[PDB]
C-alpha cells in the first residue's frame, strides 16, 4: 500500500511565475541638463561712443 | 547661453520586464496644461503693464 504520486495533479512547474515584467528602471534616470541663457537676452551695450 | 545643463535629457529606461498588475487609482491631472492660468500669468501682468 505504496502511495503512488507521479507528478499526478498535472505537471506544469509551479504555480508559479506569470513573468510580472521588469521594466529598464535598472537604467539610471536621465541628466536634466538644460541651461538658461539668462545674460545674453539684455544686450547690454554702451551706444554711448 | 547653454541648453540642458549638464548635457540633461531624458535618455531612455528599459528595466526588467516585471509584469506586475497595477490597479491603476489615478491620480486625475485638471492641470493637464491648466495653462490658460500661465497665459492668464502673462494677464496677471499685461493688466499691470497696462496700468503702468
Same mark, same amino acid.
Given at each position: 500500500?505504496?502511495?503512488?504520486?507521479?507528478?499526478?495533479?498535472?505537471?506544469?512547474? /509551479?504555480? /508559479?511565475?506569470?513573468?510580472?515584467?521588469?521594466?529598464?528602471?535598472?537604467?539610471?534616470?536621465?541628466?536634466?541638463?538644460?541651461?538658461?541663457?539668462?545674460?545674453?537676452?539684455?544686450?547690454?551695450?554702451?551706444?554711448?561712443? | 547661453?547653454?541648453?540642458?545643463?549638464?548635457?540633461?535629457?531624458?535618455?531612455?529606461?528599459?528595466?526588467?520586464?516585471?509584469?506586475?498588475?497595477?490597479?491603476?487609482?489615478?491620480?486625475?491631472?485638471?492641470?493637464?496644461?491648466?495653462?490658460?492660468?500661465?497665459?492668464?500669468?502673462?494677464?496677471? $501682468?499685461?493688466?499691470?503693464?497696462?496700468? $503702468?
Amino acid at each position: 500500500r505504496s502511495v503512488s504520486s507521479s507528478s499526478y495533479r498535472r505537471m506544469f512547474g /509551479g504555480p /508559479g511565475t506569470a513573468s510580472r515584467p521588469s521594466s529598464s528602471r535598472s537604467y539610471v534616470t536621465t541628466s536634466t541638463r538644460t541651461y538658461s541663457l539668462g545674460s545674453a537676452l539684455r544686450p547690454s551695450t554702451s551706444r554711448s561712443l | 547661453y547653454a541648453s540642458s545643463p549638464g548635457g540633461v535629457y531624458a535618455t531612455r529606461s528599459s528595466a526588467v520586464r516585471l509584469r506586475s498588475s497595477v490597479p491603476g487609482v489615478r491620480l486625475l491631472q485638471d492641470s493637464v496644461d491648466f495653462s490658460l492660468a500661465d497665459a492668464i500669468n502673462t494677464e496677471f $501682468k499685461n493688466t499691470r503693464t497696462n496700468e $503702468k
